[PDB]
Amino acid sequence: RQLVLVVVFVALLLDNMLFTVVVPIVPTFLYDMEFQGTGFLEEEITRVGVLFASKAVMQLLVNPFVGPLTNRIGYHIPMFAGFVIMFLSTVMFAFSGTYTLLFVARTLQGIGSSFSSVAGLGMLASVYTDDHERGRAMGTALGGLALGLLVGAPFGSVMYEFVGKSAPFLILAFLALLDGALQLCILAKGTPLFMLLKDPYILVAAGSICFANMGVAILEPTLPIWMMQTMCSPKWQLGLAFLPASVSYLIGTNLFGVLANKMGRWLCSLIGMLVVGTSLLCVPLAHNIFGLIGPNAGLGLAIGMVDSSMMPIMGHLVDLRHTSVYGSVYAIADVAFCMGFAIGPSTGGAIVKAIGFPWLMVITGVINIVYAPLCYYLRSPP
């Protein structure tokens, strides 16, 4: 039972590290091939946004098909697919030389990520039947996701200007190959998601999570381009500037998971959304790298507060009114992240092409601040 936990942790870690490691490398890779430096990425922001939203679009498309596929052919065969398609994606990323190959790698990564996320969690649920170690296993997997998010950003940024461009992808490929060998030596219906989104409260919670995550979603594809255009930071600090967004996130989720039950979940979500908006407003004001330490850390702490205050309310709402499954909250919450990462990067390129960069953060801040009073609905649902 420990081996399956190890392989699931490794797979989620690899997926999160790949997702975080593409962000430092793609803008600098595009800039290096064509020609601090000259500014011409304003035309390419829209294609960068489409490339970043490709994985979210593919995951949303392939999500409902993965459901009944596992019942027919078990869980090992589609879990085996995630490792191999992630291998093809990480191999294509290292050897990609044109924009078209990166798109194929992104969609292939999205398909593999969806398959692995369904299959590994299903295998974890099937393996543990004691009704108490399942929660610990899920918490360990989520901590692995957090660790991958923490460690992915310094990976590519540090080892692009130092040890080459293809270096950070073959290490991930070797790690994925290690995961495949580990899993190779191996061995109640719940109101479906299409009907769970028909009540106002769960929809409000999902919208709150999506609008909280949309700030980071629009911060990812457009921040390095702004950095090279304005602050003249070196190429090894673009991924260094995103450490607070994960460190403060983990600190906030720990602290507010400990202390949100006493002072109210909806109040925690409200203040988290409000400081998300304030941090997004304060982000475009910095004129150096050190100016981003404050607003980014605040945004990460706020998003951690919002998640820690919104997941238990979603679980309670699903349990009280509908029938819950072991991973019921996973489906609704994953759709919020998927919808955010699908609508953020795509619309952000057009927004930054039409108007300036800071207006996007102003728009997102007013959107978060406006949606924040809507959290009054969630206190004591009937």
Ligand X SMILES: COC(=O)[C@H]1[C@H]2C[C@@H]3c4[nH]c5cc(OC)ccc5c4CCN3C[C@H]2C[C@@H](OC(=O)c2cc(OC)c(OC)c(OC)c2)[C@@H]1OC
Ligand Y SMILES: NCCc1ccc(O)c(O)c1
Q: Contact at 8 Å (CB) between 286 and 295?
A: yes
Number of Cα atoms under 13 Å in the Cβ half of residue 266:
16
Query: Stretches 15-23, 29-37, 121-129, 363-371: which one binds ligand X (CB under 6 A)?
Result: 15-23
Query: Stretches 56-64, 101-109, 242-250, 370-378: which one binds ligand X (CB under 6 A)?
Result: 242-250
Helices (H) and strands (E) counted in the chain, each on its own, are 13, 0
For a copy of itself, give the closer residue by CB, 247 or 274: 274
Q: What are the Cα distances from residue 258, in Å, to 255, 274, 309, 377?
A: 5, 20, 10, 23
Rounded Cα gap, residues 106 and 111, in angstroms: 9
Q: Contact at 8 Å (CB) between 297 and 245?
A: yes
Does position 220 interact with ligand X (CB under 6 A)? The reply is yes
Does position 333 interact with ligand X (CB under 6 A)? The reply is yes
Q: Contact at 8 Å (CB) between 113 and 60?
A: no
CB of 223 to ligand X, least distance (A): 8
For the chain, report the end-to-end CA distance as a whole number of angstroms: 40
- Note the residue count of the chain: 382
CB of 47 to ligand Y, least distance (A): 21
Task: Return the residue of 160, 169, 249, 256 that touches ligand Y, per CB under 6 A.
Answer: 249
For ligand Y, give the closer residue by CB, 183 or 308: 308
Task: Return the residue of 4, 23, 58, 118 that touches ligand X, per CB under 6 A.
Answer: 23
Which of 181, 144, 120 lies closest to 16, judged by CA? 144
CB under 5 to 8 A by kind: which of ligand Y, ligand X, a copy of itself, none does 16 bind?
ligand X
Query: Stretches 96-104, 158-166, 167-175, 212-220: which one binds ligand X (CB under 6 A)?
Result: 212-220
Does position 300 interact with ligand Y (CB under 6 A)? The reply is yes
For ligand Y, give the closer residue by CB, 82 or 300: 300
For a copy of itself, give the closer residue by CB, 276 or 333: 276
> Which parts of 169-228 interact with ligand Y (CB under 6 A)?
213, 216, 220
**Pair of tokens at residue 162:** 């130092």
Query: Cα 289 to the chain's mean position, in Å?
Result: 23
* The Cα angle at residue 246 between residues 241 and 248, in degrees rounded to 5: 100
> Which parts of 342-381 interact with ligand Y (CB under 6 A)?
none
CB of 290 to a copy of itself, least distance (A): 15
3-state SS assignment for residue 296: helix
CB of 86 to ligand X, least distance (A): 14
Rounded Cα gap, residues 59 and 63, in angstroms: 6
Q: What are the Cα distances from residue 104, in Å, to 109, 248, 265?
A: 8, 33, 41
> In this structure, what DSSP letter does residue 322 have?
S
Per-residue interface string for the shown chain with ligand X, residues 131-150, x marking contact by CB under 6 A: -----------x--xx--x-
Task: Return the residue of 4, 205, 245, 310 that touches ligand Y, per CB under 6 A.
Answer: 245
Q: What are the Cα distances from residue 38, in Å, to 5, 42, 114, 274, 324?
A: 48, 11, 38, 36, 55
Does position 246 interact with ligand Y (CB under 6 A)? The reply is yes
Tell me which residue has its CB nearest to ligand Y: 249
Query: Stretches 157-165, 269-277, 329-337, 356-364: which one binds ligand X (CB under 6 A)?
Result: 329-337
Residue-wise DSSP of 99-140: HHHHHHHHHHHHHHHHHHHHHHHHHHHHH--SSSHHHHHHHH
**Residues found near a copy of itself in the complex (CB under 8 A):** 267, 270-271, 274, 277-278, 281-282, 285, 362, 365-366, 369-370, 372-373, 376, 379
**Residues found near ligand X in the complex (CB under 6 A):** 16, 19-20, 23, 142, 145-146, 149, 153, 213, 216, 220, 242, 245-246, 249, 300, 303, 311, 329-330, 333-334, 337
